[PDB]
């Protein structure tokens, strides 16, 4: 990549100032920036919180519903220090995608609306003045860019997804302008060996120059265990205290460039030490097989819409902590980095997820964007020890050769990018039938989506939603894959305060009673390895006839409080 | 007809007795009832309240969702001075068809779930004994009779009912029973016809009875007093200053007909009437010579627990919240309704759409859920029509019959198809009013064969909800407005009446800006279909869709049945309500 992915830190070479707050804000809809000098500046701007998705704020359906160009400015003070740094524009995400300006200059676009954007402005950048930038973004939704869906012209557009969630956008995570040292720490990957009671920290640093590079590994008290040279190398740890499930350790790893006697760059970042993976239907981690419990969540609150806030974060860890879960699934991109950080913390397994939702020539280029989401995704978050697998398409057509090379091409770039080759999936859909599927094979264990009981043979046919899928399991069994099986989807809508005796489909009664008939069938099957449900919490959706405030299959309500059935994975995943 | 649809009266002449109350109630899952002797008395009962839905009593799936064979039972003493009359068992309904027994010996059977069922049971009844009614029903859908639907078989045996239609399906015996004496010559039928000449009125009659004895026809005014009087079966009562029965605005006569043999009396049968004319006129619908816009709901029998059961609180506080919206008029969608509520409507004034249950005709729903059927339907069709017009005829509230509800019309074969319920539903009915049905978005203007046959036009449009909805309710508006354009350059010179128009709408919900589902976004959608139904001349009613919200089968699209109600299921407005109240103020 032509920038690094790392987290910003703080410290005696690097440093970093917070753009959020209030930013200014207009629409675009005759496409007139661009033209009309808006790089200098907004014509007639209100404000605009950051970070969040612009969506919500407002109090007209136009405003909520807009689709197409819009553009973000603010202004922020440049410390006179920061002068012959590299300095640098992090956006946590710019959704979906825009272009970049400084000082009315043009720095770089981006494609892709979940992942870091990287804006070099070490040539315009005015140290010790007061400085600009102005973001060009475009929420549209196309079949060459993730996510995919339409875009309708009533000439004002209307964005038309292929996927369920509402397609929240703007400035949806944390604005740094951040400086780094000429020469630093680019991105750096490490891989872990257990060797009885040590371990083993293999590593790769990649620098932007040519000098030495010192690698220690201090343990959570800030002690060192183990210290080597050069870019290449391994850190031997004796009694290593290993990350485990809901019982995290991290270490810090940190990475000295150095001339001489003096220090060029220092790069620190917490480690988890632990290993992954598949064998046979087992999942291991750490040599022990773990069962997954837990649920695909979203980046999706009140107001907010997929604004970040770490209140969110506590609040949704202490609550799959309460039902014993330990893994959820960033259904269905890329969530801000600091859920990663905080699922080290506390012990949690993640899938991280591409926004590889919603699958004509176009498909070429679509490859192209999907395996670019797919790069910057792992170099991004490698090096999380919660992260144990990729999940790297969500429901696309899967029973054509011509899907099974699409796949081949994603599964082959995610292995080049990924140092540790942990476990690649991806989440399928009913019509991946078994007979016809072409792309299980691809992956080391094979997630499914599935709705018995409620999209096929729901409420009083559940009965025969069970044998239909007792049927389907049969069949996968039947091939004798040797791999493991996770459930990535299931669940019902399900209106909080609906009761009924006997239960009806939306009830609070029959999300208990699907659960446990789905529990029933999977305790059946001894190659089934994981339950995430869908989903945490009730979420915002495009609005329409099947959805009455968003998706309501949620097993916490959109304010995160438990439904009925809550008690019941709680009691469960004990 | 072999039996007469009157209501029932208590007279010197005529007896009745209410078989409502815990009736005993068995499932027949094995459908051996009949072959194990169940007509001389259930095995293992439990107890079941009629009139009432018998779904929603039960806290298990398996009883709420029966389908197939289930039995009703109960006893009653006859008093011995009901001997040599006519005995019957009438049933207000039997839900959907059932065979009736007394005293073990079977007596009738009937097909067609909402109206009435009489069975003559002089030949067995026990007058000064305990006697005993046993009722074989059965509630699955077919495509032979109304209301049309599927029976699924569960890999187990178990059937349960697949509707091509959206609304829960309810059975039993959803209204009240009677056990009644008439006299051995009686008053079968009567048919009444209005014409106004100025001050007064004629009342132009038929009189059928089950004798030769002589005829006399009086009318009594509101207070009881005679203001006509004639003899024979049929003739005409010339009423001098007539008060006549107008829009929330009532008033009633009685008429009084007596079967003489010069002696004295052998029969009496008394009901109120209004006198009031209906007809179309170009684009106008007259009401006694005046033109009417008709505004109001389609509504359902339905109620929380009950289900279809019958109740007059139902029918009063639901009556009281139609005139708190300043309404005229109701659709009895998508069937008929109990007697009790035209009754009502008379006597408040209400306009009814009479419909019959020919609904599920659509050929996408059945698909998704025939060259041998179609006789065999239209002739259950055209029997529901036949039995509903002779029950409701004489009924000032009903001023029109509906005979469909969003069937498939674009076929030269459905044309030939409704034209025979129209020629019949046109000899059935002795004031020839006007006769219509509802159409699904299907029937475009430029496909439907089937709208010539009516005298005025009721669309069924959901612009802004299945068609174009929330961020596209501009679209919505433009398509709406380019249909009505199309039907505008017809120039048919007919009313038309939109029957359906609405939003699932979750009390509760509200949103800024609206969103689909919410309270805010059913004002919105009003306010932008009352636009549209104001920019046309020709568009003479509005009838929404729905009074309440009701129950559904269960499914993805239902979150606990139909949620298009204005009013909530407990009868209480959503924000909506008032909009309606202002504009029909």
Same mark, same amino acid.
């Given at each position: 990549?032509?920038?690094?992915?790392?987290?910003?830190?703080?410290?005696?070479?690097?440093?970093?100032?917070?753009?959020?707050?209030?930013w200014?804000?207009?629409?675009?809809?005759?496409?007139?920036?661009?033209?009309?000098?808006?790089?200098?500046?907004?014509?007639?701007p209100?404000?605009?919180?950051?970070?969040?998705?612009?969506?919500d704020?407002?109090?007209?359906?136009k405003?909520?519903?807009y689709?197409?160009?819009?553009?973000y400015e603010?202004?922020?003070?440049?410390?006179?220090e920061?002068?012959?740094?590299?300095?640098?524009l992090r956006?946590?995400?710019?959704?979906?995608?825009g272009?970049?300006?400084?000082?009315?200059?043009?720095?770089?676009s981006?494609?892709?609306?979940?992942l870091?954007?990287?804006?070099?402005?070490?040539?315009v950048?005015?140290?010790?003045?007061?400085?600009?930038?102005?973001?060009?973004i475009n929420n549209?939704?196309?079949?060459?860019?993730?996510? /995919?869906? &339409?875009?309708?012209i009533?000439?004002?557009?209307?964005?038309? #997804?292929?996927?369920?969630?509402?397609?929240?956008?703007?400035?949806?995570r944390? !604005?740094? !302008?951040?400086?780094? #040292?000429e020469?630093?720490?680019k991105?750096?990957?490490?891989?872990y060996?257990?060797?009885?009671?040590?371990?083993?920290?293999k590593y790769?640093?990649?620098?932007?120059?040519?000098?030495?590079?010192?690698?220690?590994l201090?343990?959570?008290?800030?002690?060192?265990?183990?210290?080597?040279?050069?870019?290449?190398?391994? %850190?031997?740890?004796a009694?290593?205290?290993?990350?485990?499930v809901?019982n &995290?350790?991290?270490?810090?790893?940190?990475i000295?460039?150095?001339?001489?006697?003096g220090?060029?760059?220092?790069?620190?970042?917490?480690?988890? @030490?632990?290993?992954?993976?598949?064998?046979?239907?087992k999942?291991?981690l750490?040599?022990?097989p773990?069962?997954?419990?837990?649920?695909?969540?979203?980046?999706?609150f009140?107001? %907010?819409?997929?604004?970040?806030?770490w209140?969110?974060?506590?609040?949704?860890?202490? /609550?799959?902590?309460?039902?014993?879960?330990?893994?959820?699934?960033?259904?269905?991109?890329?969530?801000?980095?600091?859920?990663?950080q905080?699922?080290?913390?506390?012990?949690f397994?993640?899938?991280?997820? !591409?926004?590889?939702?919603?699958?004509?020539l176009?498909?070429?280029?679509? %490859?192209?964007?999907?395996?670019?989401?797919?790069?910057?995704?792992?170099?991004?978050?490698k090096?999380?020890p919660?992260?144990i697998?990729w999940?790297?398409?969500?429901?696309?057509?899967?029973?054509?050769?011509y899907?099974?090379?699409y796949f081949?091409?994603?599964?082959?770039?995610?292995?080049?990018?990924?140092?540790?080759?942990?476990?690649?999936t991806?989440?399928?859909?009913?019509n991946?039938?078994?007979?016809?599927?072409?792309?299980?094979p691809?992956?080391?264990?094979?997630?499914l989506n599935?709705?018995?009981?409620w999209?096929?043979?729901?409420?009083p046919?559940?009965?025969?939603?069970?044998?239909?899928?007792?049927?389907?399991?049969?069949?996968?069994?039947?091939?004798? %894959?040797?791999v #493991?099986?996770?459930?990535?989807?299931?669940?019902?809508?399900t209106m909080?305060?609906?009761?009924?005796?006997?239960?009806?489909?939306?009830?609070?009664?029959?999300?208990?009673?699907?659960l446990?008939?789905?529990?029933?069938?999977?305790?059946?099957?001894?190659?089934?390895?994981?339950?995430? &449900?869908?989903?945490?919490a009730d979420f915002?959706?495009?609005?329409? @006839?099947?959805?009455?405030?968003?998706?309501?299959?949620?097993?916490?309500?959109?304010?995160?409080?438990?439904?009925?059935?809550?008690?019941?994975?709680?009691?469960?995943?004990?």
């Amino acid at each position: 990549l032509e920038y690094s992915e790392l987290y910003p830190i703080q410290n005696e070479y690097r440093m970093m100032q917070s753009l959020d707050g209030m930013w200014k804000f207009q629409f675009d809809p005759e496409e007139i920036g661009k033209k009309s000098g808006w790089e200098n500046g907004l014509p007639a701007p209100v404000s605009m919180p950051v970070p969040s998705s612009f969506a919500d704020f407002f109090t007209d359906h136009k405003e909520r519903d807009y689709c197409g160009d819009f553009w973000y400015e603010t202004e922020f003070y440049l410390p006179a220090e920061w002068r012959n740094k590299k300095i640098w524009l992090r956006f946590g995400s710019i959704t979906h995608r825009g272009t970049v300006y400084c000082n009315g200059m043009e720095i770089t676009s981006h494609e892709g609306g979940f992942l870091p954007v990287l804006a070099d402005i070490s040539t315009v950048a005015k140290p010790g003045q007061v400085n600009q930038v102005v973001v060009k973004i475009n929420n549209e939704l196309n079949e060459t860019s993730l996510p /995919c869906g &339409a875009t309708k012209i009533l000439g004002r557009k209307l964005a038309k #997804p292929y996927f369920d969630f509402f397609n929240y956008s703007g400035l949806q995570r944390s !604005v740094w !302008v951040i400086a780094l #040292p000429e020469e630093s720490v680019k991105d750096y990957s490490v891989d872990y060996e257990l060797c009885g009671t040590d371990a083993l920290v293999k590593y790769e640093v990649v620098t932007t120059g040519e000098h030495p590079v010192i690698v220690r590994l201090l343990d959570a008290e800030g002690e060192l265990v183990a210290e080597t040279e050069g870019k290449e190398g391994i %850190l031997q740890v004796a009694n290593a205290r290993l990350w485990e499930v809901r019982n &995290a350790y991290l270490y810090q790893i940190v990475i000295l460039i150095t001339d001489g006697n003096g220090v060029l760059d220092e790069y620190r970042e917490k480690i988890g @030490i632990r290993t992954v993976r598949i064998e046979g239907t087992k999942i291991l981690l750490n040599d022990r097989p773990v069962y997954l419990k837990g649920f695909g969540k979203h980046e999706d609150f009140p107001i %907010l819409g997929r604004g970040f806030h770490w209140g969110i974060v506590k609040r949704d860890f202490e /609550c799959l902590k309460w039902t014993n879960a330990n893994c959820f699934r960033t259904s269905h991109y890329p969530y801000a980095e600091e859920w990663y950080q905080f699922a080290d913390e506390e012990g949690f397994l993640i899938i991280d997820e !591409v926004p590889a939702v919603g699958m004509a020539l176009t498909v070429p280029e679509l %490859l192209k964007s999907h395996i670019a989401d797919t790069e910057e995704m792992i170099t991004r978050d490698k090096n999380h020890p919660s992260v144990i697998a990729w999940s790297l398409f969500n429901e696309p057509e899967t029973i054509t050769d011509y899907a099974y090379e699409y796949f081949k091409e994603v599964f082959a770039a995610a292995e080049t990018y990924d140092f540790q080759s942990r476990p690649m999936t991806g989440a399928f859909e009913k019509n991946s039938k078994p007979e016809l599927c072409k792309c299980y094979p691809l992956c080391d264990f094979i997630c499914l989506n599935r709705y018995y009981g409620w999209y096929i043979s729901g409420g009083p046919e559940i009965e025969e939603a069970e044998e239909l899928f007792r049927d389907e399991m049969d069949r996968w069994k039947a091939k004798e %894959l040797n791999v #493991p099986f996770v459930f990535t989807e299931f669940g019902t809508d399900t209106m909080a305060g609906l009761h009924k005796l006997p239960s009806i489909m939306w009830s609070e009664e029959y999300q208990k009673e699907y659960l446990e008939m789905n529990f029933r069938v999977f305790d059946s099957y001894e190659f089934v390895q994981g339950e995430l &449900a869908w989903n945490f919490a009730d979420f915002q959706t495009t609005e329409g @006839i099947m959805r009455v405030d968003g998706n309501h299959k949620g097993v916490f309500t959109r304010d995160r409080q438990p439904k009925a059935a809550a008690v019941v994975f709680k009691d469960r995943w004990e």
